[PDB]
Symmetry: D2
Subunit: 266 residues, 4 copies
Amino acid sequence: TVPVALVTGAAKRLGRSIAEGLHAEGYAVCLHYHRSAAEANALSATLNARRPNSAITVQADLSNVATAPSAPVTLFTRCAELVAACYTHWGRCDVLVNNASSFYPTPLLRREAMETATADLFGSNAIAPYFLIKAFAHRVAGTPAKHRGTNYSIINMVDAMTNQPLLGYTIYTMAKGALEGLTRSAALELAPLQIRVNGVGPGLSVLVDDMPPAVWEGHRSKVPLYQRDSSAAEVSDVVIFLCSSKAKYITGTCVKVDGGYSLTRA
Amino acid sequence: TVPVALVTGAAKRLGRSIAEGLHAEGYAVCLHYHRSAAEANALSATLNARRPNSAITVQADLSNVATAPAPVTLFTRCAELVAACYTHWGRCDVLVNNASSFYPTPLLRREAMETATADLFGSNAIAPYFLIKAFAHRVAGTPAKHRGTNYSIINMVDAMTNQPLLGYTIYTMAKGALEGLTRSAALELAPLQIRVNGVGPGLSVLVGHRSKVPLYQRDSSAAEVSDVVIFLCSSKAKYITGTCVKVDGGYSLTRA
Amino acid sequence: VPVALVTGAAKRLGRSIAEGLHAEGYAVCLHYHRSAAEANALSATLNARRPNSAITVQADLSNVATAPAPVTLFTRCAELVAACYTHWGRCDVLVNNASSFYPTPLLRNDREAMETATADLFGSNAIAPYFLIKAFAHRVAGTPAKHRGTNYSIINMVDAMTNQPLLGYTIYTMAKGALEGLTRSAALELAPLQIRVNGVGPGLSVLVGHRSKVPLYQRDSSAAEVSDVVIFLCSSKAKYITGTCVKVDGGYSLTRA
Amino acid sequence: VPVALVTGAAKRLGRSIAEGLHAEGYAVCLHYHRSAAEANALSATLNARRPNSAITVQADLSNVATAPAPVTLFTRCAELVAACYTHWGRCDVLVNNASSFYPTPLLRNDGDREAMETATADLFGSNAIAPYFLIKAFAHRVAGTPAKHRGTNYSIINMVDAMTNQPLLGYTIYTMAKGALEGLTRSAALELAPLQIRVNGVGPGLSVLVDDMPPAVWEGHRSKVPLYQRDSSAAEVSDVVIFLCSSKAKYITGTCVKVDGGYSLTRA
Ligand SMILES: NC(=O)c1ccc[n+]([C@@H]2O[C@H](COP(=O)([O-])OP(=O)(O)OC[C@H]3O[C@@H](n4cnc5c(N)ncnc54)[C@H](OP(=O)(O)O)[C@@H]3O)[C@@H](O)[C@H]2O)c1
Ligand SMILES: NC(=O)c1ccc[n+]([C@@H]2O[C@H](COP(=O)([O-])OP(=O)(O)OC[C@H]3O[C@@H](n4cnc5c(N)ncnc54)[C@H](OP(=O)(O)O)[C@@H]3O)[C@@H](O)[C@H]2O)c1
Ligand SMILES: NC(=O)c1ccc[n+]([C@@H]2O[C@H](COP(=O)([O-])OP(=O)(O)OC[C@H]3O[C@@H](n4cnc5c(N)ncnc54)[C@H](OP(=O)(O)O)[C@@H]3O)[C@@H](O)[C@H]2O)c1
Ligand SMILES: NC(=O)c1ccc[n+]([C@@H]2O[C@H](COP(=O)([O-])OP(=O)(O)OC[C@H]3O[C@@H](n4cnc5c(N)ncnc54)[C@H](OP(=O)(O)O)[C@@H]3O)[C@@H](O)[C@H]2O)c1
Ligand SMILES: C[C@H](O)[C@H](O)C1=Nc2c(nc(N)[nH]c2=O)NC1
Ligand SMILES: C[C@H](O)[C@H](O)C1=Nc2c(nc(N)[nH]c2=O)NC1
Ligand SMILES: C[C@H](O)[C@H](O)C1=Nc2c(nc(N)[nH]c2=O)NC1
Ligand SMILES: C[C@H](O)[C@H](O)C1=Nc2c(nc(N)[nH]c2=O)NC1
């Protein structure tokens, strides 16, 4: 009676906090990672030490490109394999959290760089979530009704601030917009299977501080509530609540966790 | 520390469920009511039997009119609701603006048209404003060292008002005003760490469009809505403010 | 010759809207509250360009009773619309532009001043528009189908920035929120009468340093930059548009602190 | 004489947009993918009305490389914009209208790789990725123009969809791509504001609704629209696009305007 959660980009920061929060609620967790192998395996060791066989790790580039094997492996296949990993190891997959995401500039103003940025930003933020949801849904539909879990839930990590675009981040902002569209469309189409699909949108959380202290403090001070970025738990606790049975009438909605930052203007 | 919650229109349906859910979390609750005196007092007896001195009831018409004592204004009646919490328990940590009148005000086929305006706008928008203002003043007037650590205001909005119910214009306008109050108060009260959010039901505890709700094809139970209210008031939701959460089973995703 | 009723038409945006509609051929009823001299000067100018193409009517749109029994806001609103029918026999366009705008701080930081602020802010920005729309619609419904105009349009002047609240302006921000709700509800309910209802939301316009924060041009807009949008929405080319609010803010709502 | 580049201009809304801009005095570059005959007929008509006021250019805006090394989508987009500069020496307006639209069901019931792989590249490419590369090329051309030679009314219009927030069942990728296009509208509006290039969206509800279905079914669909109980004509949408490109709309940017007759106001 142990539910299973698949969390993408689970090695650190918010994803790790989400994986820890779901684990604390009793979930067995599949921790996906791309380049953070060491951090992911350390997290798994910790959770497995607290509760045997309660965590595994799986690696996958969620960029929208074909990888090397036979023939080239497509993104859809790599996504189907992540979900399959949960069924193979534990025989179920109740929760999917699309958290993995690349984030960097793609200025409109002044080849392989543009080609890869597009595939990477859109892949991790939108296309992989789409294939992952599709595979997740196919698994549930293919499960005899009597054997289906009673609390399926998909959480897409969106962004509370994309409607007030960050200058120079167009592809990323576009991908997050696509991800909001996926949240609504999948919520409507998967409703018959009682699979809920919602979004959680952070404002500033564990803000990257690779800049002069005054600039990092200036940025944080703009959040109306508390004048700081949020901790990882302040975001993950909301993800955990939406996956809980008490949130079962909630679907197709995006919940901002931004301390009022989207309420500000220049 | 035993926190206090003020819930308007708490006698039955969603408000009753919200008052019960907050009480289950440990809150002492002030149950406001307008005409449902018997149910409000029965609810209070039940909660007080579970935990002595954990509930009181207070009556008030939240319509935007003057009542008989000079005439008493809506603002004064609202300030007295919040004062009731401070007088009895010395604090007021949570305010849930749930009370609300709801009935048609067709644009196509002046005593009832004016009481309708005062009633629909008062309960749904103006009283919430005065209640929030009084709640905030009491917190500002409390020495920092003596302030609670988890202030939260929840405005009960409506997930479907952007797809207007035919013939309910004033009500739809009032809920729109209540969304604006949610955002403006969240911004202005952020310095006092008072969070302000909204919860918007779709169809709940219906007493025919039921089958059009995408998820489960039914209206929600009262708890399916109140559990969300309770979560937003919890410390786990402390970075959330100025936001409205739909609890509608995907109903706002539909089209004719 | 179509007729337009424009509230708060004496100056700034309302004046520009009245001028823009007049330039398209509309006869205009200029409503004013305290700006009698500016309203009458505007009317003289328009009537000099085209005889009997403008009139002025006074009314406090605050949600209170006035002395002549007491006159209610609904009655004063119905009389504004009736003024158009009495003088010209029609009312094709209604522009709810009149609006009070001032602080109503939640935090302290005389006592009836709240009573009047509430009635004034909510009345001009939300309640009067409601009564005006209701009266406008009843007159169209009461007109035999064969004699109805072919291009009914109501424009509500909303605010592009209210979702990023101005600190201390709660009642005003709430009232504009109610006005957006009226725009959608009325659009839906009046669609059968082919009465379109939309909103135009300025960001910063004709300001009496914030300006420099607007992405496009780094300045507030001119009155015409807003009114030309109102005029377009009332034109027959915009006839499939209803229930929608159009921001005219130079990208200001796209900014963050 | 200003110049407008309209993608998917051979028929329906794109044709109407090209005709509307042409009637205002614009020279128009009509892009097409498979509708060569329609596109050339439209160009002949416009050129007969005003010599050298239209050209046609072909391009698959799907997000795939084409045969010439392989040609990338970005290059094909840059060449569309370049065609306007090469022929007329300018490009003032860009209307991203081209768009593929068909089902991509999450469930089968609730060869193969080819239809998925191509659907994703096609739906996302036409509706979101090509618009991005076209906007980027359009902007680079303006930035590279000495201030003294720049046009005075640059405007980009992205054709979005008023109903995507009430998703059409089974059209997830398309719905996602339109969401991305709304994000592009806001992000580019903000970033290009310094060059006075405005970027807005126009979102139809139901327009010139395809009627390949029983008449009672087609009538039932259009009857749901609150205003007039019908889908819109092509002009009812294109006149809005033309207004947004006009100098009277010069303070408008970053916004999406619904042209849906109130359809998004309905609920099931
Ligand atoms: N932090 C904020 O302020 C903030 C604000 C708004 C929205 N969000 C959203 O909240 C979520 C979590 O935020 P975060 O700051 O914790 O994220 P993050 O640290 O930037 O990245 C999360 C993980 O995503 C993975 N990832 C990136 N590209 C990938 C790819 N192409 N294929 C597979 N995996 C990839 C990385 O895994 P490896 O390390 O294993 O390679 C990374 O650890 C994201 O969706 C983000 O957009 C965060
Ligand atoms: N139920 C739904 O499907 C639904 C859908 C969308 C939004 N909502 C919102 O959720 C909240 C709760 O909904 P509900 O169905 O439980 O509400 P409800 O039963 O319609 O009414 C709640 C209480 O509001 C009080 N009230 C009404 N007018 C008042 C006035 N003028 N002054 C003082 N109190 C007044 C009444 O108290 P007395 O009985 O004591 O007089 C009533 O019991 C409301 O804000 C509602 O708008 C509900
Ligand atoms: N200007 C901006 O930056 C801006 C920004 C966002 C939204 N808007 C909106 O655009 C519209 C026009 O803006 P604006 O700056 O031109 O407005 P404004 O100058 O502030 O006022 C317009 C007119 O409203 C009338 N008015 C105010 N209270 C009234 C009342 N209680 N009863 C009757 N009339 C009343 C006044 O008429 P009298 O002078 O005759 O008394 C005033 O001339 C308004 O709805 C406003 O909210 C403007
Ligand atoms: N019609 C409606 O009710 C409606 C509703 C909401 C939104 N919209 C939006 O309004 C715009 C115009 O609508 P519409 O009905 O006129 O569109 P449409 O007829 O479905 O298609 C427009 C053109 O897009 C081109 N196109 C499709 N895929 C392409 C690709 N991969 N590469 C290059 N070109 C491609 C086609 O050109 P060729 O014929 O030359 O191949 C087609 O003629 C679209 O963005 C649409 O999404 C329309
Ligand atoms: C720095 C920026 O203002 C904001 O904190 C965001 N950070 C991130 C993001 N997305 C990811 N994947 N990682 C981040 O650190 N979206 C927005
Ligand atoms: C019936 C309607 O469709 C919907 O369930 C609503 N009900 C109610 C409401 N508001 C109140 N106060 N009471 C209701 O029963 N808002 C919307
Ligand atoms: C000053 C403020 O930031 C903004 O320009 C607004 N001005 C006004 C407004 N409303 C009115 N009636 N008058 C104004 O001058 N709404 C917002
Ligand atoms: C048929 C549907 O309800 C609606 O009219 C749409 N049609 C179209 C669309 N997009 C394109 N490209 N073509 C269409 O015909 N988006 C939505």
